[PDB]
Amino acid sequence: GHLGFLPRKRAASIRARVKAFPKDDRSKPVALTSFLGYKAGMTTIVRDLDRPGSKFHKREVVEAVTVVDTPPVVVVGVVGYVETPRGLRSLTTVWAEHLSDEVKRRFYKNWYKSKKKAFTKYSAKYAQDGAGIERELARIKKYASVVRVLVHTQIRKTPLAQKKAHLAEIQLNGGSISEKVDWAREHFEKTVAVDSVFEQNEMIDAIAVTKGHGFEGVARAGQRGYHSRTSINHKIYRVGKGDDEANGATSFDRTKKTITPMGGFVHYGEIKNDFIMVKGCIPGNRKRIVTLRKSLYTNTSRKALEEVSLKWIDTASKFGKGRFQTPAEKHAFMGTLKKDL
Amino acid sequence: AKSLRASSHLNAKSVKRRGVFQKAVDAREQRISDKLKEDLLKQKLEDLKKKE
Amino acid sequence: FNSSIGRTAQGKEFGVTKARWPAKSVKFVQGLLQNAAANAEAKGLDATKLYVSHIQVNQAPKQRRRTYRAHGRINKYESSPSHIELVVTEKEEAVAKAAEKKVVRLTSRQRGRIAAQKRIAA
RNA sequence: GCAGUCAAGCGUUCAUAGCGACAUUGCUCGGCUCUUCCUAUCAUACCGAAGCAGAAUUCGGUAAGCGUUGGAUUGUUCACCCACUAAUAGGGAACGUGAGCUGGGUUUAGACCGUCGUGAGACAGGUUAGUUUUACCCUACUGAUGAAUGUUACCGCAAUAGUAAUUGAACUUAGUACGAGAGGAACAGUUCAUUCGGAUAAUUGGUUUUUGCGGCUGUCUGAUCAGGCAUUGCCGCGAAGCUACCAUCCGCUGGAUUAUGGCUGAACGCCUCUAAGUCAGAAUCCAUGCUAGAACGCGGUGAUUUCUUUGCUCCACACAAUAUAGAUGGAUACGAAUAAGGCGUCCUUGUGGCGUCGCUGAACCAUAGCAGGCUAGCAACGGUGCACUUGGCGGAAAGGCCUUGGGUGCUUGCUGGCGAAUUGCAAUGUCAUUUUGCGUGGGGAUAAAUCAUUUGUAUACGACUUAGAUGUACAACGGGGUAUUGUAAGCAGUAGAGUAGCCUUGUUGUUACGAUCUGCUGAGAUUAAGCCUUUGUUGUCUGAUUUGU
RNA sequence: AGGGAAUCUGAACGAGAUUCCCACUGUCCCUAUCUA
RNA sequence: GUGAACAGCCUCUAGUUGAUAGAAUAAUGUAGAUAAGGGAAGUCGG
């Protein structure tokens, strides 16, 4: 096999942490560098191909895309790291004073038995003109060469029966560390949307813990699957919206439909919020939390520069076989049934 | 065939990266940060919904 | 005596990965504990201040079953019986506040020094 | 190789005691499969020489990063055929790979002894030996738990170890460069594919004890329907799941160099790519990226049990204990250079002038008091201890550094007066600093984890992810969707072969039996067990343990 | 009421042997899934 | 008894329910199936 992907062992957690970040330019505006959601879905798209030099210039191509569900990420903190001869070293983290039920749930393994007394003295530590919070924020701005944002996911807006959101750390590639820590100050308790991180025609690297297959039998026997994998260069085809109906509508199809198939995806619900439709196949299975970083570097070929003109979204039944896009088209083709009249 | 780490191809790709190839990414970044700045104002309006 | 036990979650309590549910042995021990508790009643002792201080199980003379067999061999099987014995004891809060005199010998230079110290210090 | 031709020298003087290098002249047991390594490299990368016009090629240099195919082959193959490919390079892992294995050879093959035998061999005489192989050993290698460092939880950092991409051609560039012509390139731009790896199941194909639905054969309930049943009786379709270059997606960019080409330039009054310097330059190296995280590497942050008969932490003095890889005046802070510097002063403010210093820390600062007591003063506004206190500074392990002041003892700067002894001529003579426990007298703070049940993104077992003390809670049912099968049971009919039966002998005459066709009927059944959704109904919400700076 | 055709061997043969022609198959390309 | 049948499959009379159990259900192994396209290219040798 590949000797790089060793030791071929089970990961530390389902939420794999992002190993490296995109560099930094100290003149660029403040913007997030990685996003997270919940991968669950896969679907077929057709599009006309404006890729000149190819055998399919001004032709149409069918291809497989994946739908990661991405509820609006909520900022609950910021971390500052000093540059040492020993690597980086977190000197101060700061939180949001009033955090959701989801994250106070993340701080316990057994949620129901506890008195739910998580950040009581920390919120009481805030309870004045600030004084100590602004002291720690001065501490971050004075030192700390890089600044990373503590976020979490909106787990309840996702159909998952987990209730327990994931903490993460996302660096900022907007220059002047002052603007980093003050962007964070403008964003405590607030939420960050998907399309404020990504857009169409943008290459990303989705990282995921790879679908556990359990025990398996130099070509050696042992563990197969459940490894933390980084896959790079998956083009974003569509960023979606929850409130907006006709997400499944293209420039061509234009029928008022959601990208959610009939009876939803298999083993996972519908979509009730923002999503990213990424091309190809992201690692992990359905219901799996994926962390989407962006490219690391200027990765422009013509596979990264071209504009996607989506023509049609397959929303037919994945559970079973596909014959109808809408429920409306099933009973339009069928005629009327027994229990109808 | 020239390798992935073939010196001449890395230099030819650096000739690319100082032209159109970075400028499109540096326009896309401005459009992303713009909508991020737009995301503050909406939430501030929903601050003023409760403040009303 | 724990080689090739199926490791359990219920051993976390004791810091051991391997643990078992040995029904026959448990039933015998609690039969002896019930006997010991009643011996405590007959003697006239407390019920809640009562802890097991000594519990010792050592090997007994083995039983000798035999079964015929490969090549018609006589592979001798042996039961491994045991002599269980235990003592339950009254718990004692604050045992003693008394010690030995601990007589200290010290030379002319130490006698002299201590005397000089009490001439100076309070 | 032999003989001769030269022939640097040496032969004890030395060519005529002899040896004698490079040349030169005479004729002439084999093979299947994997892992790792070597370079003495076949291809891929970059170069140098070559009548190298272009293309193609030959030799040579650096180079082991990555590659090195598919069939027919058996008079002893110790041969080779015919293609594909960029190319199908050569070897090691001393009996590598026969205790990972087979395909064809000894003749009833070891050793000793005997009998009959001219030169010549037999005898199915006779005695014999042919033990390392299994280890429910040992440990490598893969993977998995795990006590400990207050507990417990979340977010992290990254020492170290591994690492990966590969080759082919297609379009412009072109029918241009170059070419009598025949032919015929290359960089920059873009497009695919091959091998390899990491994944993933949208669709396609595959697959079925959902044995889901349907059909057939048999077999039992006395017949329909239901099925009992058939070593899963047989057949068609087939969800979920699992899956295939039989499917689809994805697989990077900066420095340092090698051969080589150079710049300035010595050695050597020319020159010289090298000696001091110096630019470029390979698929090379090291990083970036990609994977694990040290369970005795580290950081930040959240919570830390309240009547346990005030449990737990923090300040003060107090007694016991427990130790110390080893206090016993002070770890006393510029940086850089060495063919140079430090300091002081001055000015034209500089790679500046002038003076001075080192040649050891042999220094410098602290240092005299019952192991440092008690007191009388004199001189000066100093030095220092202690605790209150104004800030500023310190992130590389900051955990300390300076500073503003008020009080407060002490001062050996100088001079007085008391006290020390008997520790008997020495005996470390104990004065340091950790880790604690029991007592005190004041502050402060009001938990989680495990088991058990559930979950299924996980799963040998562990472990992991979940869920649950009155809620857009959870469980069971229930409804709605989506799928799979293909028209359920029952009933009716004018559709009815063919027949029994009233005689009006029928030109859908009739009463009944009557395969099947038709209708209610894309119906019926199943549909989460690892699909979706939940205003319905019904119920659950509390058991044991363990943990302290 | 599994083939077929030749040949070597003791004209059909005999589950004799070999070679070829036609059909068939997971033996393989290249494995994948299910049950016991 | 059904069946052309000593094939099985089902039973009457009569006799058994004896063989450690329970909990899980991943890979491997043995055995049996099915499979796109090609159809011995596998292998010394269908």
Curated annotation (Swiss-Prot), chain A:
The gene is RPL3. Pfam families: Ribosomal_L3. It comes from the Eukaryota. Component of the ribosome, a large ribonucleoprotein complex responsible for the synthesis of proteins in the cell. The small ribosomal subunit (SSU) binds messenger RNAs (mRNAs) and translates the encoded message by selecting cognate aminoacyl-transfer RNA (tRNA) molecules. The large subunit (LSU) contains the ribosomal catalytic site termed the peptidyl transferase center (PTC), which catalyzes the formation of peptide bonds, thereby polymerizing the amino acids delivered by tRNAs into a polypeptide chain. GO terms for molecular function: RNA binding; structural constituent of ribosome. There is a cross-link at K28, K125 (Glycyl lysine isopeptide (Lys-Gly) (interchain with G-Cter in ubiquitin)). Component of the large ribosomal subunit (LSU). Mature yeast ribosomes consist of a small (40S) and a large (60S) subunit. The 40S small subunit contains 1 molecule of ribosomal RNA (18S rRNA) and 33 different proteins (encoded by 57 genes). The large 60S subunit contains 3 rRNA molecules (25S, 5.8S and 5S rRNA) and 46 different proteins (encoded by 81 genes). uL3 forms together with ES39L one of the contact sites for the signal recognition particle that targets ribosomes to the endoplasmic reticulum membrane. Disruption phenotype: A mutant confers resistance to trichodermin, a trichotecene toxin produced by plant-pathogenic fungi. Its main location: cytoplasm. PANTHER family: 60S RIBOSOMAL PROTEIN L3-RELATED, LARGE RIBOSOMAL SUBUNIT PROTEIN UL3. Keywords: Cytoplasm, Isopeptide bond, Methylation, Phosphoprotein, Ribonucleoprotein, Ribosomal protein, Ubl conjugation. This is Large ribosomal subunit protein uL3.
UniProtKB/Swiss-Prot annotation, chain B:
Coiled coil: none annotated. Residues 1-11 have a biased composition (Polar residues). GO terms for cellular component: nucleolus; nucleus; preribosome, large subunit precursor. Residues 1-20 are annotated as: Disordered. Present with 6210 molecules/cell in log phase SD medium. Belongs to the UPF0642 family. This is UPF0642 protein YBL028C. It comes from Saccharomyces cerevisiae (strain ATCC 204508 / S288c).
From Swiss-Prot, chain C:
The keyword Ubl conjugation applies. Disulfide bonds: none annotated. GO terms for molecular function: structural constituent of ribosome. GO terms for biological process: cleavage in ITS2 between 5.8S rRNA and LSU-rRNA of tricistronic rRNA transcript (SSU-rRNA, 5.8S rRNA, LSU-rRNA); cytoplasmic translation. It is found in: Cytoplasm. The keyword Iron does not apply. One of its GO terms (cellular component) is cytosol. The modification Phosphothreonine is found at T8. Its main location: cytoplasm. Keywords: Cytoplasm, Isopeptide bond, Phosphoprotein, Ribonucleoprotein, Ribosomal protein, Ubl conjugation. Component of the ribosome, a large ribonucleoprotein complex responsible for the synthesis of proteins in the cell. The small ribosomal subunit (SSU) binds messenger RNAs (mRNAs) and translates the encoded message by selecting cognate aminoacyl-transfer RNA (tRNA) molecules. The large subunit (LSU) contains the ribosomal catalytic site termed the peptidyl transferase center (PTC), which catalyzes the formation of peptide bonds, thereby polymerizing the amino acids delivered by tRNAs into a polypeptide chain. There are 2 genes for uL22 in yeast. Belongs to the universal ribosomal protein uL22 family. Component of the large ribosomal subunit (LSU). Mature yeast ribosomes consist of a small (40S) and a large (60S) subunit. The 40S small subunit contains 1 molecule of ribosomal RNA (18S rRNA) and 33 different proteins (encoded by 57 genes). The large 60S subunit contains 3 rRNA molecules (25S, 5.8S and 5S rRNA) and 46 different proteins (encoded by 81 genes). uL22 is associated with the polypeptide exit tunnel. This is Large ribosomal subunit protein uL22A. It comes from Saccharomyces cerevisiae (strain ATCC 204508 / S288c).
